[PDB]
Amino acid sequence: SPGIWQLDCTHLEGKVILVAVHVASGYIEAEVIPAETGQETAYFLLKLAGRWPVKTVHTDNGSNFTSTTVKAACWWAGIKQEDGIPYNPQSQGVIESMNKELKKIIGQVRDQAEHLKTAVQMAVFIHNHKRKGYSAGERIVDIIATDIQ
Amino acid sequence: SPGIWQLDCTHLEGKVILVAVHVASGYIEAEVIPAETGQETAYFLLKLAGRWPVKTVHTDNGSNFTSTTVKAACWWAGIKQEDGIPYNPQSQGVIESMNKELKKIIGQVRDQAEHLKTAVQMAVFIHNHKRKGYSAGERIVDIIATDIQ
Ligand SMILES: C=CCN(Cc1ccccc1C(=O)NCc1ccc(OC)cc1)Cc1ccc2c(c1C(=O)O)OCO2
Ligand SMILES: C=CCN(Cc1ccccc1C(=O)NCc1ccc(OC)cc1)Cc1ccc2c(c1C(=O)O)OCO2
């Protein structure tokens, strides 16, 4: 549970937003890329796993599950690469709701920057700091500190 | 002290590596950019502060301390922007030693990727996971969790 993350790919403005969600907390990291390739996804996972103790990633589609570059990054970074089959049907819903919330936030900040990447990092910040009372950023730290102890 | 970070700029292969270090733990985030500008530094701090509870940043030089774009991102993200004067002379040495360790790690992985940005993210991963016993990634989570509690 503390080490499990889910990849999610959404689209805006003709670009791709790649998201990793820490499933137990709802905390996210995200980036804009011009298209989802195995190299971009592999690089994104390398970044994530240098920052948080990523044990397992549920990939966002079969092409990223198949990609030998993504499998190579997961090998390098010590991550168990898994499929993203929603054996719990509530998973599809949680991810659709997250993309809709993120896109809502991006539209709320969109005029505050020229480049979509800037708006998406403002949206990561607001999402992670939003009190629901704890924020997603507080929950991930507590979950992982509990695991370390 | 759980919220205090230090910016650091180092050079390799004709490029710039921008580093944020969490002072109490030694944990780092880093990125490669073609040159250190106010916009690149402001974007980097926006990313950092959406991922960790960044209260204070000691900027790496007077150009980033002065930059109105850097000041605007620190306003947006709720960061107190401070200068980086090493009132403790041990601060100079610690940053120099970190740059030398990071460049050593980059040389140890350099032939495992074409692009320097890849090598630098491998080096962030190795640095954050190295036990010296706890790793910097463990120390930062424990420090912030203690603080939330
Ligand atoms: C001279 C700055 C260029 N713009 C000006 C702009 C252009 C259009 C609308 C608003 C603005 C505006 O000032 N908003 C406030 C602001 C300030 C700093 C800030 O720092 C994170 C983010 C936002 C902001 C910007 C900075 C760094 C970036 C960007 C962009 C971008 O516009 O996307 O892209 C990647 O790094
Ligand atoms: C598949 C083509 C790309 N190369 C091949 C390569 C070129 C030269 C030397 C070694 C290799 C090699 O296979 N090493 C192992 C490896 C695999 C996956 C991995 O994923 C993080 C990092 C490393 C690795 C790469 C992937 C993603 C990127 C990169 C680069 C890069 O070379 O820098 O740049 C930004 O995203």
Author numbering:
A (entry chain B), B (entry chain A): 57 to 188, 193 to 209
Paper text:
IN is a critical enzyme in the HIV life cycle as it is required for the integration of viral DNA into the host chromatin, and therefore persistence of infection. One component of this complex is lens epithelium derived growth factor (LEDGF/p75), which has a conserved IN binding domain (IBD, residues 347–429) that mediates binding. Within the IBD is a loop (residues 362 to 369) that binds a pocket formed by a dimer of the HIV IN CCD. We herein present a novel, small molecule inhibitor of HIV IN that binds to the LEDGF site, discovered through fragment based screening and structure based drug design, which has low micromolar activity in both biochemical and cellular infectivity assays.
From 7, replacement of the p-methoxyphenyl group led to 8, (R1 =  cyclohexyl) which gave 100 µM inhibition in the AS activity assay but with loss of SPR activity, whereas 9 (R1 =  p-MeO-phenyl, R3 =  allyl) retained SPR activity. Analysis of the crystal complexes of compounds 6 to 9 suggested that branched amide analogues could more effectively fill the pocket, so we synthesized compounds 10 and 11.
